[PDB]
Design a protein around this ligand. Structure first.
Ligand SMILES: [Zn+2]
Lengths: 48, 114, 215, 120, 122
RNA sequence: UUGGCACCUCGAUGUCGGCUCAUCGCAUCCUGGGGCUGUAGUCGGUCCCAAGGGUUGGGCUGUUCGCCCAUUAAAGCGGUACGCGAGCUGGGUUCAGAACGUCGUGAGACAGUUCGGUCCCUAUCCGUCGUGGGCGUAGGAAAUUUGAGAGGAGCUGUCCUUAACCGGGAUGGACAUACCUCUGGUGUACCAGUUGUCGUGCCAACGGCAUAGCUGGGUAGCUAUGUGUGGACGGGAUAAGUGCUGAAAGCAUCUAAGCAUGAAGCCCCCCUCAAGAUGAGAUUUCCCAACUUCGGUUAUAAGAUCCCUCAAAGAUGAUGAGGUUAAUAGGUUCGAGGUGGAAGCAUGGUGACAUGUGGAGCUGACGAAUACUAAUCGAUCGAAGACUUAAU
């Protein structure tokens, strides 16, 4: 129900090994040389 | 269709000699029996109370009264132990399942005709 | 002796003579062939390998299992066969009676045969102790605060721990199961179906393995 | 069938509003869960319109709402009149379809996934 | 499906009108009984006269369960009420009349005197 | 068990009974095997080997015990903080109220009863039930596998025959497991009947709200009380035993050397998991160049992935069906199953209503067809195989 010891910095940075985020799909647009998400519309002269 | 290969395998067992009836009708089923020595047929006459299913899995339930005690009997429609079915009357109802007749007796439990 | 692969399509009933009723499973055992033989001198054990369902041919830019790939397109081309979906063990079959390239036909089984059917059972999800195992509920009134919980998971100071095998909640469902001593009710060679008496593991469109029983 | 986080009484009323908004605006931005669900509601109504008779105009009124459309130069129209008159003549040779979903990014205040629904 | 504490109607003329199930015979830990099975019961309601009196602890055979029996043909038979017949340990009845219909499952039990005294056996 | 001692714990180691879930011992309650009997048979009495599995529902009492009722092959005895309150309950017992008998001058009390009466905690670590990612397994991949090791399962009534043993049959009880064809349950985007009230201007048709307003049915899926299957037949080595040949001991003796026989138990046989089994195994398939400063390096190959349409899979992730050279979902078309005769119209009736057109009309998940809409264009990862020795 409550922690018996504190958590060391070593054990805290290992648990956070997998707490990260990945970049999006983000391909280049053919109409404008740009970047857009895959399968979404372009936010710059919206084409698809 | 239900599924090919199921209508194609169970097709040789669909009977093609029974009449066509409805819930509310009266039937006289000639079921066959094997007691200790021989084969005999025993008639069972009552109201059809429900038909459910489709294909070889179809069934129906007829209801009678014996000595004040109700006895409902259920058959697989294409069973090879029914010798013949005969439609005595054709009553007039408003539902597909006559389950309300279970709580009725006498003049309260009468089905019309035509 | 007498293996075959097939797919479960569903249950029905038939009427045997004497007017019995027989629940039945319909299996679709179409396009089996022999893909390879394993011998004691090369592999250490005898068996034959069988592939069940026909798969489309190799194409570049294929983005799914619908098409064979170059490693599998070639293995099924040592024997002269099209690519197969499923490919299995058959170890209790005498290998000398088969040739690589044969077509294991549904007629190998005859009505009256005792068989074992293997398949992966359905799959249920995360389940609790009451559904997953067969455990009792607590009282549903009388002050109770114990309804679907597992019991006590251990004892006390002696064995200050849980033993391996406690029956807690977790993923229930899809395992490998044999049912033994089932029966062949009828073989239909024009459609290539086996009518098995009873029921078998898994979902519809799932893979099953029929073998003659071990007794 | 999705359930969309509502109760079956609120989920029904929310699609009768989504459907009557496609009939009027021809194009709306929703979320992508309400778009996949409401395409089925508005396409089953287009076939009632292009079916034509009176008994199918009686079954379209069980779903559409009582809204008036202001045409050009004050010629008002009911959303059930616009569906059986005008949306039922341009879709008279198409066999299914009628509608188009287009994805956009996540919106800002929650990362819900924006979408546009058109009529094709 | 009869279990302990189930009340049946008596379908002979032995003096009893209602019984209470005390135990279903058979095996150890056995939970329910059906047509053709033998229960131990007690008389809860009798008729003035007759051999069986209120409070007796008797044995009975089950006839006419309200959730009936399934046959090998895929046939079924259900009844409107549960009943039983007080028997004598040689499997013969204690009365001499039997009321109402009766199921054909009583032949495998070898209750030939109950099936023959009864109006139509179904 | 009742105790002796007072060594651990007073800045807290939570009682009795019951519930849930077990786990071990054997000094064995049943089932298996035997010796002796004062064992004729059927039943026994006693002692030995044996822990594989099994070992019940109620009445009375807070009870534990105990006594009864009805069953069973049997109703074993003990340990585990007299197992288990960060799993549950709170009936007994020793909180504040009140009363009876009793004791006390009294305040009060029990050498005794009676009625009432507050059980907190969001899991940090080991533990254990599931499910992923990284690296390794001397090139990179895709499949199929051996099985070192591990976990399951193990129960036994009655009847027929032989006619009490040993032999043969047929059917049950209780437990396991898989499944939805059958009998049933549920089925909140399925069909129908109906009440009050506010609406769509009115009539007729309909919509909101009233537990899904209420009521009668019910498809798929999920389900037991439903439907199927299982513990079969057997091998190896032994226990208590029963022996054969045979001496130490010119005889005898199952034992010392030899040789058999012998149990529900032991090791297999059956069923699942299993190369992180760092000892990392095995089969048959696929791919295999340019550049150096000769150290090595790049991108690419075969293969995957991102992203998207999904379900037979699912907390997520993983697993599976597919991505235009396309049936993966939706729509559309035709069906299965479910409901049980729509609307409009006409006729009959004074009217509520009835009949016909017409097994009508609707219909979510189930079976087939059909590119009409969406699975567009793209992007990331991913090999060129170390040195020793021995044979070719
Ligand atoms: Zn652009």
């Amino acid at each position: 129900a409550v922690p018996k010891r504190r958590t060391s910095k070593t054990r805290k940075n290992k648990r956070r090994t997998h707490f990260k985020i990945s970049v999006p799909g983000m391909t280049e647009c053919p109409n404008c040389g740009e970047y857009k998400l895959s399968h979404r519309v372009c936010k710059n002269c919206g084409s698809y | 269709t239900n599924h090919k290969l199921i209508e194609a395998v169970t097709k040789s067992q669909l009977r093609t000699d029974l009449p066509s009836f409805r819930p509310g009708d009266t039937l006289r089923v000639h079921v066959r029996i094997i007691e200790g020595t021989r084969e005999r047929i025993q008639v069972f006459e009552g109201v059809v109370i429900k038909r459910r299913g489709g294909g070889v899995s179809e069934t129906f339930t007829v209801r009678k009264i014996s000595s004040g005690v109700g006895v409902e009997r259920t058959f697989p429609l294409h069973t090879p132990k029914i010798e013949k079915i005969e439609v005595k009357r054709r009553g007039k109802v408003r539902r597909a399942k006559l389950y309300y007749l279970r709580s009725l007796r006498g003049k309260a439990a009468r089905i019309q005709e035509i | 002796t007498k293996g075959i692969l097939g797919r479960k399509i569903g249950m029905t009933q038939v009427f045997g003579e004497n007017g019995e009723l027989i629940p039945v499973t319909v299996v679709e055992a179409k396009e089996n062939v022999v893909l390879q033989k394993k011998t004691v001198e090369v592999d250490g054990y005898n068996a034959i390998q069988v592939g069940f369902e026909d798969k489309k041919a190799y194409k570049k830019d294929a983005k799914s299992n619908k098409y064979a790939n170059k490693p599998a397109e070639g293995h099924a081309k040592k024997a002269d066969a099209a690519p197969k979906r499923f490919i299995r063990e058959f170890r209790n079959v005498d290998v000398d009676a088969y040739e690589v390239g044969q077509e294991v036909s549904v007629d190998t089984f005859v009505a009256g045969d005792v068989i074992d059917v293997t398949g992966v059972s359905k799959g249920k999800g995360f389940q609790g102790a009451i559904k997953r195992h067969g455990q009792s509920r607590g009282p549903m009134s009388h002050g109770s605060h114990f309804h679907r919980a597992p019991g006590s998971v251990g004892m006390a100071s002696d064995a200050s721990r849980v033993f391996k095998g406690q029956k807690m909640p977790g993923r229930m469902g899809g395992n490998t199961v044999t049912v033994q001593n089932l029966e062949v009710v009828q073989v239909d060679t024009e459609n290539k179906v086996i009518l098995v008496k009873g029921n078998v593991p898994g979902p519809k469109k799932g893979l099953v393995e029929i073998r003659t029983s071990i007794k | 069938y999705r359930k969309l986080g509502r109760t079956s009484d609120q989920r029904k009323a929310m699609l009768r509003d989504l459907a009557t908004s496609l009939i009027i605006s021809e194009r709306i931005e929703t979320t992508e869960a309400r778009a996949k669900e409401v395409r089925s509601v508005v396409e089953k109504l287009i076939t009632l319109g292009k079916k034509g008779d009176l008994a199918s105009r009686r079954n379209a009124a069980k779903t559409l709402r009582n809204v008036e459309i202001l045409n050009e130069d004050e010629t008002t129209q009911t959303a059930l009149q616009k569906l059986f008159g005008e949306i039922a003549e341009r879709y008279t040779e198409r066999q299914g379809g009628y509608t188009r979903i287009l994805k956009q990014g996540p919106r800002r205040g929650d990362g819900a996934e924006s979408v546009i629904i058109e009529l094709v | 499906m009869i279990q302990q504490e189930t009340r049946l109607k008596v379908a002979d003329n032995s003096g009893a009108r209602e019984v209470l199930t005390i135990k279903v015979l058979g095996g150890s830990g056995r939970k329910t009984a059906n047509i053709g099975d033998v229960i131990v019961c007690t008389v809860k309601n009798a008729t003035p006269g007759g051999v069986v009196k209120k409070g007796d602890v008797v044995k009975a055979v089950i006839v006419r369960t309200k959730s009936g029996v399934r046959r090998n043909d895929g046939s079924y038979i259900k009844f409107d009420e549960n009943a039983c017949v007080i028997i004598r340990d040689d499997k013969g009845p204690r009365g001499t009349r039997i009321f109402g219909p009766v199921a054909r499952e009583l032949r495998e039990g070898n209750f030939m005197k109950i099936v023959s005294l009864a109006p139509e056996v179904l």
